[PDB]
Design a protein around this ligand. Structure first.
Ligand SMILES: CCCCCCCC/C=C\CCCCCCCC(=O)OC[C@H](O)CO
Ligand SMILES: CCCCCCCC/C=C\CCCCCCCC(=O)OC[C@H](O)CO
Ligand SMILES: CCCCCCCC/C=C\CCCCCCCC(=O)OC[C@H](O)CO
Ligand SMILES: CCCCCCCC/C=C\CCCCCCCC(=O)O
Ligand SMILES: CCCCCCCCCCCCCCCCCCCC
Ligand SMILES: CCCCCCCCCCCCCCCCCCCC
Ligand SMILES: CCCCCCCCCCCCCCCCCCCC
Ligand SMILES: CCCCCCCCCCCCCCCCCCCC
Ligand SMILES: CCCCCCCCCCCCCCCCCCCC
Ligand SMILES: CCCCCCCCCCCCCCCCCCCC
Ligand SMILES: CCCCCCCCCCCCCCCCCCCC
Ligand SMILES: CCCCCCCCCCCCCCCCCCCC
Length: 230
């Protein structure tokens, strides 16, 4: 409670934990193999985020990085979370549209580059270089968003209508929410430092819960997750 952002870390921990438990209960008894994949991916996402939020709340997922002549508090646990949860969210989208394996690898690999370069930027001690890493990570994000809109055209013709509808909604949620992350980083403690760490933590908490629990609620309530069966 010594760090003002503790309240948002505590709320994030609670919301990710509750979301995990809800998805775990909701997925009980699901037998359809396709739906099992979506429940597994979508329950793992907030479960991982729960552990990383808790690690930030308890102080383990925080480190001090010297730059700008200050000791800057950097929550590195965010990147350990996103390293696994962001490819999993992309996998949800890719499986919906029955993406080619090559497209899945392009997405997951670009996503690993996005998170890894974000982590390097977050830990870099030379201030100006932090924004070089931010730019590379943003380029990887833009590549991901490009694929989400322009890499699935060969699947549109054979796509079930409920699949197309749910994918379109989830893709729009993804573009809007994922785009905000580089902005928050750029203006917050890890970039220019014009927004204080407590407001940055609040912003990432709203984004994370929306991108994980909100996204999951939309996906797991849809008929698109079930194979077409009589
Ligand atoms: C996922 C859990 C990541 C654990 C990595 C770790 O603990 O190492 C970081 C270092 O010890 C702390 O600065
Ligand atoms: C001047 C620096 C130039 C280098 C900047 C690199 C840094 C990372 C930037 C963007 C991510 C690149 C993602 C690379 C993954 C591309 C995979 C691919 O090409 O997939 C095509 C295939 O047809 C399947 O759809
Ligand atoms: C916007 C961000 C959404 C955040 C949700 C956190 C709440 C945790 C999960 C609560 C979900 C409860 C629910 O929606 O259940 C309805 C359904 O009808 C019963 O099976
Ligand atoms: C496209 C590029 C968008 C903006 C990129 C870089 C912004 C760099 C901001 C540097 C901060 C300097 C001021 C400060 O120290 O607070
Ligand atoms: C320091 C204040 C501690 C009390 C905050 C309690 C907030 C819990 C409910 C938050 C509402 C979010 C629900 C979405
Ligand atoms: C101090 C608050 C700790 C976060 C709540 C723990 C998660 C509860 C999920 C049920
Ligand atoms: C506590 C950190 C948990 C991260 C491990 C998650 C591994 C995910 C494996 C499937 C992707
Ligand atoms: C200054 C040192 C700060 C430590 C940063 C460590 C960040 C590691 C995040 C990558 C996650 C790797 C997961 C390994 C499996 C567990
Ligand atoms: C780089 C780490 C990749 C984590 C993979 C998470 C599983 C989703 C893709 C299979
Ligand atoms: C202090 C200004 C540093 C900003 C460099 C950002 C690099 C953008 C892409 C090259
Ligand atoms: C049809 C597409 C649904 C629109 C998705 C709304 C995105 C709002 C994200 C915040
Ligand atoms: C001292 C004023 C600093 C607050 C800048 C807020 C920038 C928000 C725009 C995104």
């Amino acid at each position: 409670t010594g760090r003002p952002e503790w309240i948002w870390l505590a709320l994030g921990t609670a919301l990710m934990g509750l979301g995990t438990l809800y998805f775990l209960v909701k997925g009980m008894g699901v037998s359809d193999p396709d739906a099992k994949k979506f429940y597994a991916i979508t329950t793992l996402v907030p479960a991982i985020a729960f552990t990383m939020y808790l690690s930030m709340l308890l102080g383990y997922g925080l480190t001090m990085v010297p730059f700008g002549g200050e000791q800057n508090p950097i929550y590195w646990a965010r990147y350990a979370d996103w390293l696994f949860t962001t490819p999993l969210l992309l996998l949800d989208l890719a499986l919906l549209v029955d993406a080619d394996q090559g497209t899945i690898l392009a997405l997951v690999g670009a996503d690993g580059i996005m998170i890894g370069t974000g982590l390097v930027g977050a830990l870099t001690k030379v201030y100006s270089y932090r924004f070089v890493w931010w730019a590379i990570s943003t380029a990887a994000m833009l590549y991901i968003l490009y694929v989400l809109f322009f890499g699935f055209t060969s699947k549109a013709e054979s796509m079930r209508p409920e699949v197309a509808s749910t994918f379109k909604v989830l893709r729009n949620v993804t573009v809007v929410l994922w785009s905000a992350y580089p902005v928050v980083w750029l203006i917050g403690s890890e970039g220019a430092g014009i927004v204080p760490l407590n407001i940055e933590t609040l912003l990432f908490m709203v984004l994370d819960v929306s991108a994980k629990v909100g996204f999951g609620l939309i996906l797991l309530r849809s008929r698109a997750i079930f194979g077409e069966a009589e």
